Amino acid sequence: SKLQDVIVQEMKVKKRIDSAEEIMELKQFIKNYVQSHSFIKSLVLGISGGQDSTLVGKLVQMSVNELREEGDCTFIAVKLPYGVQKDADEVEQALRFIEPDEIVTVNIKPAVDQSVQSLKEAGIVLTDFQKGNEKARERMKVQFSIASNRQGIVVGTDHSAENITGYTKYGDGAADIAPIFGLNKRQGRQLLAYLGAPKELYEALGVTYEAIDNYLEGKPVTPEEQKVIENHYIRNAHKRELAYTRYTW
Amino acid sequence: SKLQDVIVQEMKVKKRIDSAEEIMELKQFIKNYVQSHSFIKSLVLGISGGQDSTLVGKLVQMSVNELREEGIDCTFIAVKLPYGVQKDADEVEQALRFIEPDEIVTVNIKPAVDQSVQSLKEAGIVLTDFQKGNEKARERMKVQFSIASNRQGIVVGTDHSAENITGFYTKYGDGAADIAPIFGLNKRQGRQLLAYLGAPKELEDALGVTYEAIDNYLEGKPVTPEEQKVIENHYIRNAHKRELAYTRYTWP
């Protein structure tokens, strides 16, 4: 579709994936990154019970197991509830599947409500959307403080169906490495199913995820879906780049 | 070395700048960006009393002064971001008088910051003082973006090129912004522009190198072998800060 050809090339989605090949390739990247950086003793990721963090957590744990067989690093899963964990079943189910070396639970509600309260005192009343952004950036802060404290790095869950449409700038997706960039949404499910995840763990934008994934694979979609995908892609470009300078804008 | 040529070319620092020329170019970048995004009604920057945010705040206010003369509605929102009692209050207040921002908002970050520290402590993670300083910086980032969203604006950052070596920037902390107009300046160039604009005096060390040698290196000048090695190790050790999370395609 010409405009689709630009995005297809930038988002790196493969037409197809062999599960065993793709999982091996994803682990090698994670394992090569640890091996190349002397100070990495842990990898840190929040476990929301959603499909993205579930696959990436599992990839990281499997990578950490094999790193320890090759001669020292740990995976630290982080539970990040806002108040009372209401999607507790999905979170616990993700954890049972990942088998993380360590689980840290940090409730973000006291920090988030105080950020909101501090601004309210300054005359700045956040909307519910803005309050949700504060939640996401606080989740980022917890993960990087744990990574700093445990001499590790923060692992992100950004992928290409995300990258194209979906993420709070400098919030929960902001990380040191983003291993599953290049997968679209259905590809994540395929890898989760191949790994034996319970299927409860892999089951608005004005466009379906099926149209997004097809679009990323270079397939033609309705004109109406093209405009929504394309407009979402263009309006989010600032998120795929650090702050604009005289030389990038 | 050819690594100096690599670094010099990536950091875009000019060997010398004409003060009035450079202030003009920097202002045009800010004005062109606002002009190109009709929904931007405000510009947001924390005013720490340090040279970078003083220069950036001043540039932005001049940019907004001229935008409104050309018929564009825009506002500069300077933010005081004290942790308890304003660290360098006399410098913050002197910068505020020098910039004369359209609006001044004060958000004390101490309660949110201590709540983050306390919540982590409850999980068994006792942060170091360096880590607490990182929490302060990332909370400063959150306040500015919360104000920017609420006031229909963007966050203006203070990154410049000498920060790519010193790396005082906290990853995803206070330097994180929507635009970074003074990228390409080194430190002495920031001071030159501030001094030219009539600024008053807003213009230990375990880096292993002076700021003068860093600036000289960025201008493509030769420095001693020891300075060259310390600088180059700092440049490579911070490469992950001037780029988004590495993927299979950005990590060679």
Curated annotation (Swiss-Prot), chain A:
Q: Which cysteines are cross-linked by disulfides? A: none
Q: Extract the InterPro entries matched here.
A: NAD/GMP_synthase (IPR022310), NAD_synthase (IPR003694), NH(3)-dep_NAD(+)_synth (IPR022926), Rossmann-like_a/b/a_fold (IPR014729)
GO molecular function terms attached to this record:
ATP binding; glutaminase activity; metal ion binding; NAD+ synthase (glutamine-hydrolyzing) activity; NAD+ synthase activity
List ligand-binding residues for ATP. G46, I47, S48, G49, G50, Q51, D52, S53, T157, K185
Q: What is its EC number?
A: 6.3.1.5
Which keywords, in A-to-Z order, does the entry hold? ATP-binding, Ligase, Magnesium, Metal-binding, NAD, Nucleotide-binding
Which residues are noted in the entry as deamido-NAD(+)-binding?
A: R137, K169, D176, H238, K239
Write down the superkingdom of origin: Bacteria
Keyword Lipid metabolism recorded: no
Q: Which reaction does it catalyse?
A: deamido-NAD(+) + NH4(+) + ATP = AMP + diphosphate + NAD(+) + H(+)
Which pathway does this polypeptide act in?
Answer: Cofactor biosynthesis; NAD(+) biosynthesis; NAD(+) from deamido-NAD(+) (ammonia route): step 1/1
A Gene Ontology term for the protein's cellular component? cytoplasm
Q: Which PANTHER family match?
A: NH 3 /GLUTAMINE-DEPENDENT NAD + SYNTHETASE (PTHR23090), NH(3)-DEPENDENT NAD(+) SYNTHETASE (PTHR23090:SF7)
Q: Which HAMAP family match?
A: NadE_ammonia_dep
**Family statement:** Belongs to the NAD synthetase family.
What's its job?
Catalyzes the ATP-dependent amidation of deamido-NAD to form NAD. Uses ammonia as a nitrogen source.
Q: What is said about its interaction partners and assembly?
A: Homodimer.
Protein known as: NH(3)-dependent NAD(+) synthetase
Lineage runs: Bacteria, Bacillati, Bacillota, Bacilli, Bacillales
What is the gene name?
A: nadE
